[PDB]
Write a protein that binds this ligand. Sequence first.
Ligand SMILES: Nc1ncnc2c1ncn2[C@@H]1O[C@H](COP(=O)(O)OP(=O)(O)OP(=O)(O)O)[C@@H](O)[C@H]1O
Ligand SMILES: Nc1ncnc2c1ncn2[C@@H]1O[C@H](COP(=O)(O)OP(=O)(O)OP(=O)(O)O)[C@@H](O)[C@H]1O
Ligand SMILES: *[C@@H]1O[C@H](CO)[C@@H](O[C@@H]2O[C@H](CO)[C@@H](O)[C@H](O)[C@H]2NC(C)=O)[C@H](O)[C@H]1NC(C)=O
Ligand SMILES: *[C@@H]1O[C@H](CO)[C@@H](O[C@@H]2O[C@H](CO)[C@@H](O)[C@H](O)[C@H]2NC(C)=O)[C@H](O)[C@H]1NC(C)=O
Ligand SMILES: [Cl-]
Ligand SMILES: [Cl-]
Ligand SMILES: [Cl-]
Ligand SMILES: [Cl-]
Lengths: 207, 207, 679, 681
Amino acid sequence: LPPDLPDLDPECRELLLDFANSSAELTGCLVRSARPVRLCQTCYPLFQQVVSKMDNISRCARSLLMADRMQIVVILSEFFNTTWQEANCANCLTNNSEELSNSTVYFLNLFNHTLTCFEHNLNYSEVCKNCREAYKTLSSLYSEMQKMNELENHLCIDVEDAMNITRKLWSRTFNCSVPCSDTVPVIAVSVFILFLPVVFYLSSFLH
Amino acid sequence: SLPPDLPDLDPECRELLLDFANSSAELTGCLVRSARPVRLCQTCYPLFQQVVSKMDNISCARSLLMADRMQIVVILSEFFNTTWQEANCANCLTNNSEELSNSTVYFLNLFNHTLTCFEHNLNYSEVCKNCREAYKTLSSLYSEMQKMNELEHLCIDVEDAMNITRKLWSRTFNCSVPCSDTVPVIAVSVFILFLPVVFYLSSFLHS
Amino acid sequence: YESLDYDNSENQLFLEEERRINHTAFRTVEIKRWVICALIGILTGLVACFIDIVVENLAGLKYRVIKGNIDKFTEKGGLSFSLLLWATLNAAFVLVGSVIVAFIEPVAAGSGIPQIKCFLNGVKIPHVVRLKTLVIKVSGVILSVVGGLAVGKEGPMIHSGSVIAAGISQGRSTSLKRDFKIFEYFRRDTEKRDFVSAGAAAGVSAAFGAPVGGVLFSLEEGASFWNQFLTWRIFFASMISTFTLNFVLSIYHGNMWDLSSPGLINFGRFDSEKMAYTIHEIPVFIAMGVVGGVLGAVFNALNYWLTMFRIRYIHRPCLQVIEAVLVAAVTATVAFVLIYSSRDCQPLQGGSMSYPLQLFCADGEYNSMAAAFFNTPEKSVVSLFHDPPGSYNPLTLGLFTLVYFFLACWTYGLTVSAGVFIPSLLIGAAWGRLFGISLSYLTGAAIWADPGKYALMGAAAQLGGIVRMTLSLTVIMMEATSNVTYGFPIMLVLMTAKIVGDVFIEGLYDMHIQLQSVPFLHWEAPVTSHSLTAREVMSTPVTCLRRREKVGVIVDVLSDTASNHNGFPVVARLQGLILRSQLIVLLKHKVFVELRLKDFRDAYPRFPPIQSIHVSQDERECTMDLSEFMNPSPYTVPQEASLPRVFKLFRALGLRHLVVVDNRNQVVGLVTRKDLARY
Amino acid sequence: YESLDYDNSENQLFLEEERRINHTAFRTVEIKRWVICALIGILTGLVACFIDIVVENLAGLKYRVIKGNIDKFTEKGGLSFSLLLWATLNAAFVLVGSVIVAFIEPVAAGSGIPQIKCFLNGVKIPHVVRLKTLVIKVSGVILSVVGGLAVGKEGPMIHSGSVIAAGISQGRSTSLKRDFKIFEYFRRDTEKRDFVSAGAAAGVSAAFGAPVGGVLFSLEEGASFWNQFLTWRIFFASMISTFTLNFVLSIYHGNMWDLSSPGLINFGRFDSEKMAYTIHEIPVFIAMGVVGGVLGAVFNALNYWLTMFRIRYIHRPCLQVIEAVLVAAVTATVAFVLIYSSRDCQPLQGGSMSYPLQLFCADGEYNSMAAAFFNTPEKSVVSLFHDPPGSYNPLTLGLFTLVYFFLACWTYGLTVSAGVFIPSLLIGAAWGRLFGISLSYLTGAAIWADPGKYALMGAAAQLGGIVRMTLSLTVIMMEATSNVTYGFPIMLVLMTAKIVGDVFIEGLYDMHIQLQSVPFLHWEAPVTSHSLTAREVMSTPVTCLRRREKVGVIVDVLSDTASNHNGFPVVEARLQGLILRSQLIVLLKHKVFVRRLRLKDFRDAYPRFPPIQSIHVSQDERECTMDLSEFMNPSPYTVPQEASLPRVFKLFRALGLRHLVVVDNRNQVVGLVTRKDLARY
Ligand SMILES: Nc1ncnc2c1ncn2[C@@H]1O[C@H](COP(=O)(O)OP(=O)(O)OP(=O)(O)O)[C@@H](O)[C@H]1O
Ligand SMILES: Nc1ncnc2c1ncn2[C@@H]1O[C@H](COP(=O)(O)OP(=O)(O)OP(=O)(O)O)[C@@H](O)[C@H]1O
Ligand SMILES: *[C@@H]1O[C@H](CO)[C@@H](O[C@@H]2O[C@H](CO)[C@@H](O)[C@H](O)[C@H]2NC(C)=O)[C@H](O)[C@H]1NC(C)=O
Ligand SMILES: *[C@@H]1O[C@H](CO)[C@@H](O[C@@H]2O[C@H](CO)[C@@H](O)[C@H](O)[C@H]2NC(C)=O)[C@H](O)[C@H]1NC(C)=O
Ligand SMILES: [Cl-]
Ligand SMILES: [Cl-]
Ligand SMILES: [Cl-]
Ligand SMILES: [Cl-]
């Protein structure tokens, strides 16, 4: 036989079976950290090693990627990169994807504090009292990170899911609301301005 | 007593997420292992069908599926479907994905016979002679199935086999047809291209 | 109101100069027209860029200040003081922009589309194409869009391009005492009406991204003979202006390789799968055209009775500045009242708000009535288009539609510069979208019942029911949507809206033309008027001169103070026709029997009166031969010619004075624009 | 050649007619124009759909018979028999198609576009709008396209829609001798030219999917005063035509609610973001217009000398049939020799070849010169616009562009019904794609140097250089590419192509008008013409009639048999009006000699007026008189004899006149302007 036509070169079968090992690991990592979204903080070394194992084959490149109309190693890496770009996991990682950044590890520690205060303060009025001060600094830090990453141009999915859980737990299912009676001064200035055109139209008609 | 699904999942739905995470990591590793010799639509056609079952057993649907802007189980099932209908693996399966159909296993049998007859007769003069009829009945069966699909791409499992066989027959074997047919084409071509000058001179002079 | 003399005299001085120009080799007055049409397009696109950039920066600053004040007093509890800010900020921009229209130049009020529509007909509104009008209209449309009125800024681009067109084509300033020695050949009314036609097309093309719709706009108004070279120059200027706007805005947006904003409004892409129509919903579109025809009639009638109140009462300049400020404060207040008392909230869907105001929502969501305001109306038109179903609440969209209708009807005759296309497209796309919600309710989530498709037909129906444009507007709508198959339901909707509108009321552009009492020839003679001849509609005691007329009776005819005529046939067999301006230039240089077309074009804007020129008693007995200064071949009709025959020589070859003759070539009667638009 | 008489007479019978139909309960006559224009649009769209389906199914069967024998003899030997089969099939189809044009009706040859331009200008070519002209041009286009000629079918939709528009606007068939009288009012030639304008516009919109280009086409030709409601009816007919074609083809293709075929050729969509242009390649676009003007001038010069050879020597119908057969045979052999000798093979991507030939290729590859032929030219144009770079071998396109340029130039003057738009667009998209391959090589595959974009500019450049039309062609290209921003380079390229091409030779349609001596009027007076007056243009002795004169004078004036004039000013010698020949024949056939003669009596013999040889008057009838007061045009248009030639030419052209009376300082008739004295310059 000639090489590569019905089978694979032996220095090319090993570079497919390790990329098969790290891709199953990455898929399992994604689906296990799927719904409590711990995705960008659990699956970053598996993603980086999938990227490295593709870089170690694109540097039998002609015998794996460009050899069929369907490019399985290409389309699965491109799926991983679309998953990684759509999650914006680069926001959760610091500069060279070595560890979690200081902004995210500080944010995810207040999320734990706010949930422990939610648990300890269990009628949702003792919840709304004594814990409005932690929700306030949590929401302000979220706005700080959001404008901070706007100074570069969604955030990381790991922090958006945490803030989504916290807001969904605070606004509904706790119903912590602010009354803010301001209807009566708003009506009186509304009626006063809307009464100016009939005065202008009558006094110009009579005179 | 934080309410269910807000901080974390209940274990009736958690374990269902876990065994969706089991069969989806097996399928990905199978897609990478049986990738370049493309045995994709026959190695793990049952691993694809167990994923569709585990995707049906989750319909705690509003818990896992639609609870986030990044729906990992949904996008991973869309990726597996988009891989499965672009590979056309339904052509390799018979009626309800039980086993391989009779036509495709007959073609793969002929492909195996064709490569063994290539291997036996190994200056490839003993290849072009004495092995031509296997290549011709293989190409005839491929054309028959390619017309049978168009009445209703083929399966990638048989298209890669025909691609290997044609790329092996054309180059690195250099089998060809002599085709001494240039001289009558020259004669019939020069006879017809000489009719306009006869027509134009005969209409010019007789006037 | 005077007519412009668009028909050339072709006198001996015209024939002598056209021989002198075709003796200098490589005659160049035709390439100068191409240079001028290119400059007209470039400058119209640049003015559109200036308006767009300044309006988005100033509106960004204003809504940022107002948003920062609602957010501060939200949980603190002083939202009364934040209504007072936005009422004052709207009133302060509208104050500055209404003083410069009411006190400095009132012809800049509204859109300038009736005035340019009257200029291409052939009457001259007195200050329509001056530089001061351009400056005031551009600064005023900026200050009225920033001042928060229910207006747009695309309509005033037609008048701006026409003023630029009449300005740079002359090579003079006339307000600054500048005489550039460059063109000098284009200082007649023929060239000016041609270039203003080009500038109006360039303005339409910059406003909507629709060059061919601009060409058809210029060919409808200004309905002349077919002129191949003029239509080709007008199309050239129209493409130049679209490309110039797009190229300068793509540099400003920071890309320069995406030519993505051809107009001042950009409808988006309608090549989707959900956007397709079928033949079974053609009478649905006819019913929408019926609805758009009757709502535009209500709009026009309520604005007719509102305009009639204002001409009799609110007609002092200080009194009509105060009206605009109050409309500004009331639009602010009604917007705030609908925003404050609203209940539906909504999260972000990818930049669909751009000032997301959380007032009373649940800390991840945002007030969606506040997103109907706080946007440009252009973005609201584009977002009623193209959004997936379920994106709008039928209560808040229905309540926004009802209010904006009366706010836009009450903001049309104000003394600001302001457009009405974008209010009409926003009204129509809003009730067009609500018709799609009910269609998607009554048939389930059917694919043909896409509510973004019905916002397009509804916007077409309402814009056609208010202003009754059919042929140019169909091409504008079909060219902004980039879909050629949409022009068949769009033209059915515009036909239906014109018919159902015209049964009730006249139409918004023609109605203000009629209220300002300008002559304004229509497309044809009236239908029950084919039985008239020329001898009914003609002015029978014609004042005439002779070929060799005494000077003391030429100055006597021009000084009568009851018979202010500008056209005089010189006879009594007809020999030709002379104008009042020519025969004043003849008396100024004392051209007696006791000048090479430079002099008849020297004093060309604002010829001096007969009460500025002194003829001695000895000079009133000499003779002035008019034989080489008259139009030797004026247009004539016989006395028995029917009124549709004489209407169409007059309108197409755009005339000023049409002589009626006997079969003895004896002058009996004279026909002009007033004698011929009063039927 | 005669003129239309587009201007209404407005005699006392016309005033009586309008006044009488205005006293009825409801005036239906303006509403009937809208239903006639809707029928014009529907029938034009249906004729385009019929041509499309029949050409698709006949040429589909033809290339399967050829591929089934090329694939049969390619391994056994005998490929010369497949060449003989393809040449014989082309010769047979073009034999049948050319024998029905050469022998039955020769005016259906070529495209109908010069004849329709002459009808909208006001010249009557003696068979243009006629049922036998329609059925030979429809069937001859199919046999011309299926027979393998280097022609297109989109061009002759204009003549087809024009014949439909002139036929159904009357409720009468003068060929089948029937009369279903519903449309009697419209038999007056002011209506007929206005309906043909809508039919031509509908033909343009069904051809290209460009309705506004149809309206602008039929406003350029027929350069009249602005008529708002006529232009709105023309736009109505044009939109209904393109919608009817799109709807019935979507039913035929399946997926009824997928309206994706507005015209017979569909350029695709140009928003792919590799298609965007910049401002620095604006002068690269001007340079392509120079190339298009030069190559179109070469094309027109070769076609001019070939046509001048064919007028003198190949003018018998049998020799024209033999010439049409020999071109169709040679086209097959030229195509086959380039397919046989080519060493270019490539595999199929999707639907890209539609009849692929694995002639000498390696069992999974197919011959790419065989895909330049064996496809429709519409598919070749669309693939040249939207294929990614690297999809075309430069030598293959070079040889195809070189031979198809000369095959299209040799095929145009043949006696077949056939267009030239699609070969011009294919020639230009071919060298436009080569010029993008060259720019992508020098710049090292720059993104701005996308060669599909340059195929579009070259196609417009070549179509501008061959036929030198602007402002209608520009809007057709904008509306087929569905892109507003492309109208700036396309306008620049068409300007450059027309200016470069005009300095060498006239346009192709103009050349084929002036080669057959048609008195055609251009848009304005030729060069300066203010030095030339009305006195020096017109016919100086004028034969007039009196208001009340003897009919022996009438018969002697009408039967002169040396002049054959059709317009006679009626005088005292002061001008009183204008009387025609046809009206005067109707006045003589009935014995109207000195109120029972209504205006419907002039519309009885309206296309075919009888000659003066059919009227027999006795010696006693010649001595009585005929008062021409109720019947003359009481107000003809009139210029003085000192008027400039541009003032004469503009009045005549914008009103559709055929007689213009030149007059004294009194009202005495001194001359007459009758369309050949405006065309002699
Ligand atoms: N030379 C004239 N002799 C008699 N009546 C005239 C003459 N010129 C105009 N009129 C009549 O005067 C009336 C008012 O029109 P006017 O005189 O203002 O027209 P004009 O000066 O020719 O041009 P314009 O309409 O632009 O003002 C009309 O009835 C018009 O026909
Ligand atoms: N009544 C007439 N008296 C004198 N000369 C005429 C008359 N009518 C036409 N002519 C001239 O005779 C020449 C031949 O033109 P012809 O007689 O064919 O004109 P026609 O039939 O009136 O119009 P057309 O042929 O353009 O429809 C022209 O130069 C034309 O101006
Ligand atoms: C047959 O095999 C060839 C390679 O041997 C395939 O060609 C590749 O095609 C893809 C896209 O179709 C390209 O991106 C690659 O670069 C090509 N490879 C080479 C080496 O050029 C071909 O697609 C295969 N055919 C089928 C039907 O699978
Ligand atoms: C916050 O959580 C909610 C659900 O708790 C998410 O809502 C879903 O979002 C997806 C994608 O936008 C939609 O397809 C679903 O219909 C939504 N479900 C419901 C019940 O609304 C929401 O997207 C989350 N937001 C963020 C920023 O993560
Ligand atoms: Cl506007
Ligand atoms: Cl407006
Ligand atoms: Cl064609
Ligand atoms: Cl053609």
